[PDB]
Amino acid sequence: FPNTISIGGLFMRNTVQEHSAFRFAVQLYNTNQNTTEKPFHLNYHVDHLDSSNSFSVTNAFCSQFSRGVYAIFGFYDQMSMNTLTSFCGALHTSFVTPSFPTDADVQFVIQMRPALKGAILSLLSYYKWEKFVYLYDTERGFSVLQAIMEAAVQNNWQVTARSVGNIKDVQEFRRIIEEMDRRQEKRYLIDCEVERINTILEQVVILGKHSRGYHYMLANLGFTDILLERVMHGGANITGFQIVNNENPMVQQFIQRWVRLDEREFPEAKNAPLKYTSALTHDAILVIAEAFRYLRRQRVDVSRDCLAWSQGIDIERALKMVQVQGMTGNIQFDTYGRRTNYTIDVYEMSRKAGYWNEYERFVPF
Amino acid sequence: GFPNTISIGGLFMRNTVQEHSAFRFAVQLYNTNQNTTEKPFHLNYHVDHLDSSNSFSVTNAFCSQFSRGVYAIFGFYDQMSMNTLTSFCGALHTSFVTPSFPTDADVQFVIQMRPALKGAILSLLSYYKWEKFVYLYDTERGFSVLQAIMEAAVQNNWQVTARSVGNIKDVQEFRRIIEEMDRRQEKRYLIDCEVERINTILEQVVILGKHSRGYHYMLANLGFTDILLERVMHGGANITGFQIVNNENPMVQQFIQRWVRLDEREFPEAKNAPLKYTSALTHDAILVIAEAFRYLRRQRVDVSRRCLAAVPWSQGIDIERALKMVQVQGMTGNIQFDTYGRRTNYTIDVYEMKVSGSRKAGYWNEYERFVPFS
Numbered sequence: 001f002p003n004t005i006s007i008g009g010l011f012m013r014n015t016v017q018e019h020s021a022f023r024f025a026v027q028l029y030n031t032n033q034n035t036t037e038k039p040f041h042l043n044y045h046v047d048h049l050d051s052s053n054s055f056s057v058t059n060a061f062c063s064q065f066s067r068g069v070y071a072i073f074g075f076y077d078q079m080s081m082n083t084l085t086s087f088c089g090a091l092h093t094s095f096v097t098p099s100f101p102t103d104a105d106v107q108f109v110i111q112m113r114p115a116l117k118g119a120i121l122s123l124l125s126y127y128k129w130e131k132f133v134y135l136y137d138t139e140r141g142f143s144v145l146q147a148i149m150e151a152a153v154q155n156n157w158q159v160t161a162r163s164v165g166n167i168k169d170v171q172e173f174r175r176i177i178e179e180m181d182r183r184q185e186k187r188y189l190i191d192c193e194v195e196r197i198n199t200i201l202e203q204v205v206i207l208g209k210h211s212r213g214y215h216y217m218l219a220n221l222g223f224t225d226i227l228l229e230r231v232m233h234g235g236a237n238i239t240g241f242q243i244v245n246n247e248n249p250m251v252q253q254f255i256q257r258w259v260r261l262d263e264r265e266f267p268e269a270k271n272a273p274l275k276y277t278s279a280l281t282h283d284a285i286l287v288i289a290e291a292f293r294y295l296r297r298q299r300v301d302v303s304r305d306c307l308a309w310s311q312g313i314d315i316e317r318a319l320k321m322v323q324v325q326g327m328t329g330n331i332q333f334d335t336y337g338r339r340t341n342y343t344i345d346v347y348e349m350s351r352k353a354g355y356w357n358e359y360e361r362f363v364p365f
Numbered sequence: 366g367f368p369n370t371i372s373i374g375g376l377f378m379r380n381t382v383q384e385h386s387a388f389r390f391a392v393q394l395y396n397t398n399q400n401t402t403e404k405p406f407h408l409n410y411h412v413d414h415l416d417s418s419n420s421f422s423v424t425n426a427f428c429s430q431f432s433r434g435v436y437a438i439f440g441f442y443d444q445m446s447m448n449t450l451t452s453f454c455g456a457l458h459t460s461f462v463t464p465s466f467p468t469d470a471d472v473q474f475v476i477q478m479r480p481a482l483k484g485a486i487l488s489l490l491s492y493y494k495w496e497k498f499v500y501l502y503d504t505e506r507g508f509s510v511l512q513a514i515m516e517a518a519v520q521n522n523w524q525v526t527a528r529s530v531g532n533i534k535d536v537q538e539f540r541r542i543i544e545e546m547d548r549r550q551e552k553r554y555l556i557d558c559e560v561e562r563i564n565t566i567l568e569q570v571v572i573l574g575k576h577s578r579g580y581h582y583m584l585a586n587l588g589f590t591d592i593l594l595e596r597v598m599h600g601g602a603n604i605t606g607f608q609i610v611n612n613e614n615p616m617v618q619q620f621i622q623r624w625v626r627l628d629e630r631e632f633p634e635a636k637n638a639p640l641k642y643t644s645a646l647t648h649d650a651i652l653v654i655a656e657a658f659r660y661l662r663r664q665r666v667d668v669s670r671r672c673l674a675a676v677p678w679s680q681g682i683d684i685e686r687a688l689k690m691v692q693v694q695g696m697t698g699n700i701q702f703d704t705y706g707r708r709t710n711y712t713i714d715v716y717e718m719k720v721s722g723s724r725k726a727g728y729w730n731e732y733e734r735f736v737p738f739s
């Protein structure tokens with residue numbers, strides 16, 4: 001079993017904090033002196049990439065592949081997802097990611113972020129929504145949209161859906177909101193990226209739709225990065241979802257060290273709030289370390305030019321069989337690398353209103 | 366000066382045998398014209414077959430064409446390869462000309478030969494005054510139709526029971542969905558699936574029995590002529606279909622007359638299967654490419670030259686523009702493009718089969734919307 005396990009790191013635009021979290025989590029692993037928790041050194045090589053270009057994506061993947069890595073941690077968007085994950089799959093290198101999960105049956109991808117659709121549909125039912133507005137972008141795929149369409153008639157949901165991910169002129173958001181008001185819509189499900197959600201909620205406040213009698217359900221696990229204070233102060237209801245629990249001691253002990261890091265070596269640790277994707281980045285290193293510790297205890301042989309490895313299968317299986325407690329709670333996977341047996345906490349405005357899991361569905365406090 | 370030979374790439378996938386025959390045949394038809402105004406340069410190609418839509422296969426095939434030096438690439442993508450392939454083309458300013466499913470997305474360097482279907486579907490749903498209906502779909506052609514239905518449903522009073530069926534392996538699951546839909550009193554189905562999948566669904570309709578008379582199946586796929594619907598039609602179903610090839614069009618007739626006489630060994634699938642609309646689009650792709658390059662020559666445009674360093678080719682933008690500005694008459698009717706390489710000013714013909722008989726019911730275009738024949 002090698003003394004050093006090397007992993008790749010594939011970072012994109014807008015992942016600076018996660019890159020700091022990645023370096024910090026690797027440091028936390030390596031500086032443990034308990035040699036049962038640290039029986040090998042963890043090394044990485046980072047590449048930064050532009051997703052919109054196959055050349056940059058393929059180049060970064062190939063740079064890691066030729067270097068010899070036992071797994072790749074990284075990020076994708078809609079443009080790069082298939083490129084990156086299909087490369088990993090073809091070469092049997094496991095990709096561990098905090099990026100949006102897929103519905104698709106895919107191999108060699110460990111999807112750290114749990115699916116949100118179940119929790120959304122349970123809360124729509126719990127609140128007895130019938131008429132509602134569905135504002136969405138497609139940057140996290142179509143899983144939520146499809147689940148709503150499958151269930152709508154059977155739940156009597158009358159969904160006015162508006163695709164908003166291509167809107168550049170904020171006046172277009174304003175006209176949609178105005179149109180929805182003339183149809184007496186009070187309830188909005190917003191399935192967008194955090195930055196987009198913030199833009200939409202500012203338009204809500206500008207138009208005065210942030211009073212009592214309106215309800216915004218924000219379908220994004222990035223709840224703590226949403227600027228919703230101004231909406232809350234007007235009296236409208238807000239519902240949100242999180243997978244990081246501030247009362248979890250692992251979260252508390254990470255945060256206490258994290259906020260004290262040097263801003264020069266760890267940008268965005270000290271000023272910016274911790275993104276849930278940075279928590280998932282920490283949790284990715286936990287999963288990788290556990291899998292490789294498992295392989296070593298079982299005496300599995302891990303061994304080790306991209307365009308011109310059956311130890312890959314063993315690594316993938318070891319990754320998917322982990323059961324660990326992380327900043328994002330209980331971490332386990334199914335055979336497609338999807339989180340299973342996870343919990344989503346549900347927030348109302350600023351308190352925790354209940355929780356959601358796959359077996360109990362939504363349980364209100 | 367303008368080169369005596371223009372070379373294009375060809376990127377072919379699994380299950381594109383007929384289209385590959387149509388590509389070679391259309392290149393032959395271009396090259397064997399003796400009128401030197403219609404043929405001022407030789408058209409050459411280099412073909413790669415993509416053993417998979419995984420990135421390894423796709424990157425190798427793209428890089429092989431790029432190093433060969435091609436002035437444009439004709440080819441195919443699926444959901445797995447679309448972004449990989451089109452982004453490679455886009456980064457190098459090489460235009461990709463394709464009969465594959467179009468996208469909603471604003472992309473550059475992609476000439477999308479296949480017209481969008483969503484407009485015609487929504488017009489026919491309105492024309493028939495459907496309110497309650499079943500939407501059975503797969504995602505192999507993207508989400509454009511699904512999103513358009515969802516955007517319009519409340520304003521049109523559509524009560525749409527959507528079922529995603531593209532992952533079904535066991536045909537009994539199709540039977541269970543139908544039985545579930547019967548519990549909801551459903552008679553009207555919009556089926557937005559690949560042809561093979563549509564044929565499986567309609568076989569289950571026939572095996573069940575009692576799902577023809579009183580039912581209406583709107584088949585949202587331009588591959589109408591490959592759909593096996595005879596047994597459904599004989600039981601009294603209504604069927605609505607869509608096509609972009611008119612067999613009475615003289616360009617189609619003169620192509621077909623030669624096509625069906627080609628040698629089966631050099632041109633597999635020309636004699637033993639009807640012409641797939643994607644094969645017609647493949648022919649039309651070569652028409653578009655020839656016209657664009659004839660135009661570039663007349664304008665004295667510099668077309669000189671043609672992986673993994675990104676350095677776009679300077680001449681690429683001019684080639685793309687020439688491609689997108691064409692206005693030509695093809696097997697798929699009038700061919701024009703918008704700035705994103707989407708077909709514009711195209712016609713979709715609408716077919717109805719009912720127990721009284723079978724006919725062309727009308728046509729659809731963006732400006733006239735749905736026009737019924739008498």
Ligand SMILES: *[C@@H]1O[C@H](CO)[C@@H](O)[C@H](O)[C@H]1NC(C)=O
Nearest residue numbers: 127186187213214215236237
């Ligand atoms: C806001 O929440 C309250 C209970 O907290 C609920 O009764 C009310 O209906 C909600 N508003 C809307 C528009 O649904």
Ligand SMILES: *[C@@H]1O[C@H](CO)[C@@H](O)[C@H](O)[C@H]1NC(C)=O
Nearest residue numbers: 323329330331332340341342
């Ligand atoms: C789910 O997770 C809990 C830990 O929170 C564990 O005790 C339980 O056994 C797990 N259930 C499974 C694997 O089905």
Ligand SMILES: *[C@@H]1O[C@H](CO)[C@@H](O)[C@H](O)[C@H]1NC(C)=O
Nearest residue numbers: 398399400401402403404659
């Ligand atoms: C050759 O084709 C051109 C372009 O359509 C046409 O205008 C011309 O009349 C043809 N010439 C002959 C000799 O047939």
Ligand SMILES: *[C@@H]1O[C@H](CO)[C@@H](O)[C@H](O)[C@H]1NC(C)=O
Nearest residue numbers: 552553579580581602603719
């Ligand atoms: C079948 O077509 C006839 C018109 O020819 C129409 O009246 C009927 O509604 C259609 N059937 C269904 C189930 O829509």
Ligand SMILES: *[C@@H]1O[C@H](CO)[C@@H](O)[C@H](O)[C@H]1NC(C)=O
Nearest residue numbers: 692698699700701709710711
């Ligand atoms: C649309 O196509 C027809 C031929 O089908 C052509 O006569 C007409 O000029 C075109 N219209 C536009 C707006 O380009």
